[PDB]
């Protein structure tokens, strides 16, 4: 019965969850954690990564 | 012993470092300070800046 409200609630929740999970992606980089990139590679390469 | 520089024998050693989530065994010569638990502090627990 209350489907039209749960619809938008679940849509917003899924949008937020996907926006959070997108942080785990690397986008071709070596790691998703930026602190690891800062601590391992030199700044000239850390900026590019 | 009488050859060009482009054909002289070499001796290469490759070092592989595993960054997987595991208890660290090989570390750096850096020391270790005390530990506080009630304030914003920068931790360096062998894998995290």
From Swiss-Prot, chain A:
Origin: domain of life: Viruses
Annotated coiled-coil segments of the chain: 6-49
Effect of mutating residue 39 to A: In strain: Alpha/B.1.1.7
Function: Subunit of the fusion protein that is processed upon entry into the host cell. Mediates fusion of the virion and cellular membranes by functioning as a class I viral fusion protein. Contains a viral fusion peptide that is unmasked after S2 cleavage. This cleavage can occur at the cell membrane by host TMPRSS2 or during endocytosis by host CSTL. In either case, this triggers an extensive and irreversible conformational change that leads to fusion of the viral envelope with the cellular cytoplasmic membrane, releasing viral genomic RNA into the host cell cytoplasm.
Protein name: Spike protein S2'
Source organism per UniProt: Severe acute respiratory syndrome coronavirus 2 (2019-nCoV)
Source taxonomy: Viruses, Riboviria, Orthornavirae, Pisuviricota, Pisoniviricetes
Coverage span on the entire protein: 944 to 992 of 1273
Swiss-Prot record, chain B:
Designated name of the protein: Spike protein S1
Gene name of this polypeptide: S
Domain of life: Viruses
Protein function: Attaches the virion to the cell membrane by interacting with host receptor, initiating the infection. The major receptor is host ACE2. When S2/S2' has been cleaved, binding to the receptor triggers direct fusion at the cell membrane. When S2/S2' has not been cleaved, binding to the receptor results in internalization of the virus by endocytosis using host TFRC and GRM2 and leading to fusion of the virion membrane with the host endosomal membrane. Alternatively, may use NRP1/NRP2 and integrin as entry receptors.
SUBUNIT field: Binds to host ACE2. RBD also interacts with the N-linked glycan on 'Asn-90' of ACE2. Cleavage of S generates a polybasic C-terminal sequence on S1 that binds to host Neuropilin-1 (NRP1) and Neuropilin-2 (NRP2) receptors. Interacts with host integrin alpha-5/beta-1 (ITGA5:ITGB1) and with ACE2 in complex with integrin alpha-5/beta-1 (ITGA5:ITGB1). May interact via cytoplasmic c-terminus with M protein. May interact (via N-terminus) with host bilirubin and biliverdin, thereby preventing antibody binding to the SARS-CoV-2 spike NTD via an allosteric mechanism.
Record region (Disordered): 21-43
């Amino acid at each position: 019965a209350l489907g039209k409200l749960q619809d938008v609630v679940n849509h917003n929740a899924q949008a937020l969850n996907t926006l959070v999970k997108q942080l785990s992606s690397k986008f071709g980089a070596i790691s998703s954690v930026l602190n690891d990139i800062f601590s391992r590679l030199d700044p000239p390469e850390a900026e590019v990564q | 012993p009488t050859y060009g520089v482009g054909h002289q024998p070499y001796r290469v050693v490759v070092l592989s470092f595993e960054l997987l989530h595991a208890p660290a065994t090989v570390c750096g010569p850096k020391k270790s300070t005390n530990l506080v638990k009630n304030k914003c502090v920068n931790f360096n627990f062998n894998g995290l800046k």
